[PDB]
Design a protein around this ligand. Sequence first.
Ligand SMILES: [Mg+2]
Ligand SMILES: [Mg+2]
Ligand SMILES: [Mg+2]
Ligand SMILES: [Zn+2]
Lengths: 75, 64, 70, 102, 189
Amino acid sequence: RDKLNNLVLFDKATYDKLCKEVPNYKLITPAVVSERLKIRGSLARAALQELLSKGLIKLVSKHRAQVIYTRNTKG
Amino acid sequence: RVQPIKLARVTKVLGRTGSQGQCTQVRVEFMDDTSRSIIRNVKGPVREGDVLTLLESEREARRL
Amino acid sequence: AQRCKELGITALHIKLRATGGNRTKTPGPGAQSALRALARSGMKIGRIEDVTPIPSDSTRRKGGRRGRRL
Amino acid sequence: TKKRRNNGRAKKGRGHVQPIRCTNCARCVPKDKAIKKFVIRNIVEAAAVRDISEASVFDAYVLPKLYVKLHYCVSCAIHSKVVRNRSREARKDRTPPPRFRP
Amino acid sequence: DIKLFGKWSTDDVQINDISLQDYIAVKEKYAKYLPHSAGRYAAKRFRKAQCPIVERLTNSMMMHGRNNGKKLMTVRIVKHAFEIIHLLTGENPLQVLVNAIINSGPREDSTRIGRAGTVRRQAVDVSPLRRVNQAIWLLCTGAREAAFRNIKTIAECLADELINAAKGSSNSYAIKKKDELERVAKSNR
RNA sequence: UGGCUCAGCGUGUGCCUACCCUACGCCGGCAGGCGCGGGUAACCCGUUGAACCCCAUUCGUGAUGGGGAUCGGGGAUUGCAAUUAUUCCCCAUGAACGAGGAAUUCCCAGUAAGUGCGGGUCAUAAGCUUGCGUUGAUUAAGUCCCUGCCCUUUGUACACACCGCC
Ligand SMILES: [Mg+2]
Ligand SMILES: [Mg+2]
Ligand SMILES: [Mg+2]
Ligand SMILES: [Zn+2]
């Protein structure tokens, strides 16, 4: 607990983790992915809307402060 | 061995206590046994008829 | 109440006693609570008697003739 | 100034009254000067009667009382508020305060 | 039926204890479209009961100076958070709120003026009305403190505070201080 | 950063006394400048297009795009005079400061607080004060515990009155 030194740009070891396990749990937001994958958070907002364009993640709120996404429905 | 948490219903308000008004003292009847009734000092706003939790049966009873 | 129940006792004859002698004859606040809890814990109460030492005339009371100044 | 014609004590035809001890602070006070209480209190609380009556083996069990005779110096009597300083006119009467029975 | 925030019908939620049934305002009489009303709730004693509890949380969520009048921001954070807890639990957000409120309000405390051992002297059980008021304040402070210097926003931090309070895992600041108050009261019996 | 979108007090050309409030057009990036005007005022400024807030962008838990202290250079306005920088603008530096000990202030409903706008001061001007408006709560409907106040009783060796006397 001194400094986050988060990931401004992706690498292969984390990009695949984004592609396989991020769109699997109920609540995905740029804050949650930033703290979980230790990415910056600006990269989190960009990558989340990239997965929005790919269509595997559904958006609900779309606010300037609190933009909220979710996994696809299963079943 | 251990007395469980219960509830009691306020019947009448007796008056403030604690020499600050931080506590009010009211009489509570027992919902489990209506004949059983004690007097308890409580904090926060209390009016007539409300039911509140009581973690222990008998602690204190004094007349002001 | 627990020890008496596990030893086979169901009723009690309470014998109150204050400090006695030339000292205080009023039992403290623990008299009411202990007596009340014995009956409420599921035990019977019979005869209650006082064994507080009440002298005819005792010795000199500790404190001095000017009392305990406070 | 002679405050009380009674001189604060009941000694009228005597010359000396044997002392007692204050039940609170253990101060030697003359017997006729110390304020005397005689309290006939219930041996149980005013709210513990109902609980004992359930556990009493005798259905018609009379409730024993407590007989305590208290003696107080005027220091302990005033400190415990059992007596109070009264006005010049109100000092003279000797009637006990009302019992507030009803 | 009233569709608070446009959804989350209030007819399925219920209070699992009668001591707080008559002081929480999730009922149909106090079922409101939006948690925003200037109904003069401080005019008289015993009038904050009929004030809707969703509005009560909105009132208590603005503090610490920078946020003392802004209610549009507070309502939008509550709107985000209730949708978030719905997405994370799958039940009514109001049922999460009632579970959190009951499980956060400390049932005992201590307060005296004389000599005190550790904090206070004599143990006194609290009122149901003080139970709710302390519950909402403890939840708001828990969300604010967790969100003060981290990347998680107010809506998310308020969400996990009420979610951990609804279950009970000694991670909610509201239930953490609740247990501390109960233990202190037990010692000061 | 861009867009959206709502106030109310009140002032405005002067005896001496010189010093008004400003719509619009054009020039400049800005502070500013030049000409047409209006208003001695519910007539004009002015539907006072205020701020906050709201809606989108970027930032992403680091003394960072927080903060703007200190300091260099340059340009205007007011005044006769701007250095010890009057005020304002632009480009430069980016200091402490991560919620602050003992203590202590104020406060009960359109209240605190956030937030701007008029007046007074003024040739130049507000971090001051006096009023106005927007958003708007938590707790409390009690007590004499602390700090005090009133009435009665009481004691006093006090009367410059307990910060007394001795
Ligand atoms: Mg004394
Ligand atoms: Mg005298
Ligand atoms: Mg003699
Ligand atoms: Zn004595």
